[model samples]
Target: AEECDVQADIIVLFDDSSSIQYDNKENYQMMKDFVKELVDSFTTVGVGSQFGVVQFSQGVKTAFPLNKFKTKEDIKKGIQDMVPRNGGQTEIGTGLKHVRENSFSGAEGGGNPDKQKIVILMTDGKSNAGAPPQHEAHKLKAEGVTVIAIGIGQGFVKTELEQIATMKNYVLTTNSFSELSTLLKLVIDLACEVCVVDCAGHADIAFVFDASSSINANNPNNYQLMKNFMKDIVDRFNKTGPDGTQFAVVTFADRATKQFGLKDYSSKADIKGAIDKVTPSIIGQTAIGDGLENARLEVFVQKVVILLTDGQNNGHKSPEHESSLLRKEGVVIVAIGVGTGFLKSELINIASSEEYVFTTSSFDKLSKIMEDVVKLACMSCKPRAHK
Candidate 1:
């Protein structure tokens, strides 16, 4: 089951340099007020629930220390005392490295596993100084820190900020200095309330299967095995999600095939019929890469991918490299190798670092792994009711 009740400790990183221009003085005040109003909304839980702020420009300064405040008054004082710094260059990387080394150091930050550790970055432009933003982003994610990047002006790199954020939900915006406070408030609210995800309720799934002629020619029983496995997966989805979840199925060989594209069924009978219609094929070439790529697209939002393959990639142009790209593409992957000839490591690496990736020893294990993967995906997800 998905774990719940995880409260987060937030760190606000502000870009306070001369690139913002002297004319936008009101922008600073708006930011200050936004943060002050933000702290007022922190959940009434316990002491460590307090949030901190870091202002980065030429260098970095802590507006508030983690857990240094006990009451809203303390938080307000911290915000009110915040002073903008002066520097010629925006130097985002330098400020980020400094904050990572100092403000968020394990000893300084609450460093509680149960606590949600986050970094909210507000930058008007690119990283003109210090370390590269992408490297810092990767390090932060690896260390379990969710980084949200806000683009204040047209200069904001949307791609970099989204990659830095925990997900697309964390990336936000403001056209000019006037709208900064409103946008900041939305982010603050999301961090305090909706940042927590129920891992047990998580679910979105995609299945990729091999339908090459080699399976039908040499191992016909294996073809039947795959057919049954398909039905069993749909059955498990019915048992777990029970009309709440959605699923998609893709088959590949000489050409990529999408048997089902993200459909939700209210009745188990409909899903069973879908399972029954996926017939075994006897004429095709293994196009694992093409199949996986198509499967990845069929997944909506953050869905899990289950790839079942028997033969090596023979048809696709550049299948091996693309499989690894799935990880960077940000979809959860589960690769199940049925026969010899499959690239085991390549498929395994495609999956998320979490338990979202699975490899089975045999067809029986494949069936069981499918069950476990479906359960993990739907742990906390409340399936949408079909209309």
Candidate 2:
């Protein structure tokens, strides 16, 4: 069962200066275990929840991006592999700046803006290099980022930890490295409390449209009508945000061209505009199989493919072969047969199940099936229960 009611993008900043392991280098292993314990408490890592790590001393090194590691075990291995830099001085402020500019920025490697951003700083000493730590902490807070500062050992200054945290209450201190494990519950509770509520359901959907010569010959305006259908379906969900459902377009004839990816367009207007720009190909054959293969590439989360074809497949490989392959990969194939030219048996063969097959008598009658098709595609957006 999923334990989280919300999604969070957490970046843990570890201060690997010489002072942390000076008392006992074995404490470094304990620190790694600390990270593993926290990771284990999370229900899952990736998609709904993301985790990243940055180890720093004089310089900062990104252990991984929030989305790069998919499983908790992968993240735990990354934490265990982390080696302390053991630099001369600790620069907590510099590490904060590095995380903000590099790890949390979209242009750098950050996850989407939909999740709550959090910074967990674990340090044993005061900032002995770079700019004022408190000032940087304030800047991060201004950008709507939550900061938690963990000061380890008695030698560390409490005032510095207080200054680095977004709130005085956000600062956590430990008398020694041995007591670090006890702070696990408090941090996990704080994290679960502060994370952003996730958007309902998540899916990666693709629209595989038939662009063969038959579609254009049947009616010149069919392309525009098809685009309208796509636009209407996309309008059912939030398409302008990162955390919302994702969509892509694939047009096929004798060959297939992937128009875009799930991440290509975020707004309804942009999606509609791109759909409007789709032109019917002059290709002689309808290679529905090739189109399904192209659409399958973008499948993630809830994999769904909405295939609209006006005519039967004329390609070398049978459409059923590729459709079967896609279904085996857990992709829900929805086949929409438009016009009298498409065979019911062919539509059934292309779809994952008979219920996923929709048919209309003619180009003008295609709109009649719009409501049901959109319902099925949108229903596919139901969120998966993560462990």
Candidate 3:
């Protein structure tokens, strides 16, 4: 299940501008329903969740503060009473700054430092007034606040909202407002999906892919499979920066080559793009140790190695020694053995633990257990940490 049940203090920035209302009132009414339905799903976590709403246009107003309501019914009642102000412009940054500085200060008894702090910034128009949303959003995230940006209609640009959210996946959009009625569950699910899970906070992960001649013999498609798998694993992480996740990749064959370094890319999109550029430059034998050795040199709160191999090691170099050294340094390794000829016992020897090893009969099946592999690697983060 998604982490829907959260002990979180939630704040929603709603768009009440005339652009949302237009001439007919259906669109604006749908917008309000979207917000109400979101809270309806998230209004209750284990200890119960607190909610607040801020309306921003040319100006800003807090229809209710985080401390204003204690139940779903009360929150909905407050939601029902709102009427679109038919505003002239959207002020996303102003709304962001207000809550970051005052609302979450716990200064007015509106927030608790113990609960997760989330801001769902919903907007339908471009910003023509107030502070730059991107700058304010970075500040919010830098201060450890998570922002989920939802931008809709023609006035919205994907880049504007993507910059505001924690990452690209946290931004939602559509051309028609018709999709909004079913959007309640999506926004609700995303909130929990973005919740700081295990190593989602700060993980420095190394991707080790085997691209030896063995790959070409089986199917060149297997090499492509490894590349595609990289993006899926990366999607679970935060961006590369302080208080986020970073990735360094190594490709193994006759030898292991450092495809990229930890600080090479800052965004998930960039890292994924880099993965696409990696070529099977060296192809001969599988010396898994070369990959692990290079990864050990470049290592986070949770240092993890996602090792993917399709053949048994023929080179004299020992992966066992490298595996032990990495383990001593508190690194977690998930060994994935794929293709018909992949070694099973080596995976057990290379992995940080037996449970960290996964085996598949073919390269196509690699993607099937992608989620399980990510969770296993991230599970090394035994303590709860946040960004």
Candidate 4:
């Protein structure tokens, strides 16, 4: 479960200030061990992962980039070879600015808009020079970068850590350098779930379409709008070959049917044709729970289910309960509630998070929000919490 196979761009910033290496070199060695342990856990490096390093004291140094080192041994060796530079003062802001401007750039083999960008910063004290670190943190967040701040020992400032991290929960602390090992698992888990810009070629996604009788037949094209919405989403993920994104379709009425499997359709034309041909089930009951269960069986590196419903469930099974179980398997469930009779609670319960749930007053409004739905679905493909 700890093995993360998804690709991402990452930069690690270390504090080699005088407060750390000048007084106690053993603490610096402990820091090195912490670095080694982190590099060891990410076995899927190079092809799916890239790492860069920055060491800061009075200024910052770019030791490497995301695509620089190809092996764990090389990264470990680089960490071991780092010599402490006992310097004038701590300038964390300077290090962060350097990472944003130079290290994460495409020329440095760091910036790939398609990959998740992360920065892990280690420091024992507050910044005393250069720009404010919090301002730089906000800039990183604005660019969709996630920052994890690790605060060490008595010199650590909790407020500074909170400011550096993208979220308060991303801030981690240790009473002493010896306890830094305890945080290795926490950091690895967070990095594992980082979201990617495009889920195509990175996840297995299932589209669970609702086919209940409540859908209006007056417009005739009302259902066609729903199908178009699905096709638009498929467009975002359907790449050209066997190695591209895998998709499955599940439609539910009185019961669920597996319209396709993850590998059933390989090309956008085939998938769009299938969507165009979908006819209204005209079934009396909505069996959303059954459809969710069928979607859980698809095979892929990252699992996701996008459920569109207009009415309440038939109670053939508990959609909420099944969704909870699926989420436990690291599957992300997104629910888009359309039209009348669809309770907000149902959508909230079935979706992985409140943010993943989208509500439209009618099916016609769904197309307006189709891009938003696609964005959320791609985000749902990655992991989020340390747990």
Candidate 5:
């Protein structure tokens, strides 16, 4: 057996068959909303998490694959795009079997922790087909996966679902769909607690650097401001969130670059050196908006992208081109505007929410602004219970 604490992944098996009463369309609608909430709260990959959807009606369909969500938009779109089918019996067991056999193929799936493996098998009814002996979760549990069975309607077979789950505590049966999001949030948080190793030790923070030509030799003060901004982030990172959380940095110009990977470190000197070595001046045309579109893709952990730009891209791509994309990506972007005429509205628009975008008028406030960013990121960290 192997011991690892890299975080865990979640697989949601949704039953969209005819068993759900036509009047209960609201249930499925609420299910969609639940998925959006999950998308908003979870971090894929480096946090050691990933999620995908499986719809079982007459047959099984993998709507999304197990991977880090580049943007939250895609996650919401996948759920919104689902439409119910009214033909066959609920084969939730069948769907779950596939997830076990195919999705978590031990050779390829990275998050195969002995206890962290999970399947939230959701349905509104009992299984019509015989439970295959080989696919039984108990059998899989012998090999190491933890199955969580969810029975979501009055007529569903709670006993059968419970039997398949790893234990009685893992069985969750509910008559109302209103609790779906809450259930999912609990599940995700639990999975993180059980799987994401060293999570409590690291204080998570992200640095977003503006790699635009505006900060080049064209403006000495602004150029130094950009460099100092990076140092400021490194300095505060030294103070907190060290081994307690992961830290990442992203630079945007023509595209987004993950300048620093997600990992924990105690010293500020090494982190500061990496940021200092990154000369982010005189790179390309100022594509604040276009770059945001790419930033939405590279974020694989608890993300805070700090966008510092002197002007919008008058050269190519509309400012709003990345707005919807950014909203979909679900990142908190702190916009540090150095000069008088930078695109404040555009940065605010591309942010996940109005409050997510931080605006600053003077360049000297970069350090203070980043300190606030780190504090905000730490605040969003999921709560933990100490023994």
Candidate 6:
């Protein structure tokens, strides 16, 4: 049952400029092979995912329409038969507009309102020939067509790829063409992916930490243990972005610090390294309400909070009402209660459900409960419509 069986409509746009064929005339051929390989990876074509292609340099040439062939071999041959489209400019916007306008015209193209509409496009350089590419890209996304933008070789613009994609996370790039082989597999998987909240690409979580001296024990090792807890939780879901899970950090003592935002880092290593620099507060009380309020600032389709604490709230306001507001926004709070003083009842009240609460008698035993705690976050991630 787990297969590339996505029901969608897809279109591919490729570069056809002289620049792509400059140092390596093999580049276009290589590009063509990549597209063929992409088709070969998908098991469903007819009545599943329909595909079309258009070649663009300064001008766009429709290689084939989506409804042309129902067999995989026929589509592969159509890709192989695409002739040279040598031109001076890489008019990406014009080509995209051409497909966008024509896709829904008659009964000829792959555009469908019921199924997910997707576009897979690769470019090597800037859009010097046509109007700026983002305008076409923004319009396409507004029409609910998701764009997956790819760039490779030299002279590629990363920001333009970000701008072209439905979201920046769908933008993928590589320094070498050989890696193109690797990325196409990723493209195919992304297209066929089952949209779920817990999927690495769908979550946006906030790590709410109790930074008081009691939790840290004012010792370096305790701080290190705290860091490891955050690291391990993030390690579960690998990717980070709009198309992937993102995380932010929040710390609370007498006051709350919005340590970072979701947009701060893009990789696990980057976020982990940021976690390493965090130093807990030595003097103060835990203000769990402020922490939850700060976590509520950022929103995702599956908004979550991993509340870690060794003590109950002793702040100006109660966290009960604040967490209630968060749950109303569909934020799932997974509370981790550590050590003797941590109030299990308080954590249970703040968490989305009794199933969302985790506890350990001491920091040393916190390791044993971590695996189970992470699963609680996963459960609240009910499958939602893809963003």
Which ten-residue region of model 3 has the weakest summed lDDT? 378-387
lDDT of each: 0.64, 0.74, 0.75, 0.77, 0.59, 0.74
Instruction: Report the C-alpha lDDT of model 4 over 1-387, residue by residue, as the tens digit.
Output: 244555667788999888887657698889888887777666567456777889888888776666677888887888888777776778888888888888889888876666778888999888988878878876776677778889998787876776677544467899889899899877877776565557555677788888776676455667888998998888887473368767778888888888777777778889788778766677767788887887765433767789998878889988978787787777777888887768878887787655567888887889777876887667533454332
Q: Estimate each model's TM-score.
A: 0.61, 0.49, 0.55, 0.55, 0.44, 0.55
Best by TM-score: 1
- Cα lDDT for residue 357, candidate 4: 75
Writing each residue's lDDT as its tens digit, candidate 2 over 69-152 gives 888888889888887888887888888888887788875446566677778889888888886677777677667677887888
* C-alpha-based local distance difference test score of model 3: 0.75
Which of candidates 4 and 6 reaches a greater lDDT? 4
Q: For candidate 3, lDDT tens digit of each residue in 1-387? A: 122666678888888888777735688667777777777666363246788888889788888877777788788888888766777988988888887887676654455657778889888877778998878887887776768888777788776786677644467786666777555655666576433347456777888888687776746787778788888888876456555888888988878889888888888899999999987754667879888887887542777788988788765568888887887676777899886677887887787555467888887888788887877656533322122
Model 6, 168-277: lDDT tens digits are 44667887666687786557655654333254447778898988877656445776787898888888885775668788899988878888899888888989998888
Clash list (residue pairs), candidate 2 = 240-266
Tens digit of per-residue lDDT, candidate 5, span 275-297: 76665644665666555655555
How badly does each model clash, as a count of residue pairs?
Answer: 12, 1, 1, 1, 10, 2
Lowest lDDT 10-residue stretch of candidate 1: 378-387
Query: What stretches of model 2 exceed 4 Å from their correct place?
Result: 1-5, 195-387
Best candidate according to lDDT:
4
Query: Candidate 4, which segments miss by more than 4 Å at Cα?
Result: 1-187, 238-241, 298-300, 379-387
The Cα error of candidate 4 at residue 114, in Å, is: 14
Single out the weakest 10-residue window by summed lDDT for candidate 6: 378-387
Ten-residue segment with the worst summed lDDT in candidate 2? 192-201
Candidate 4 TM-score to native: 0.55
In terms of lDDT, which candidate is stronger, 1 or 2?
2
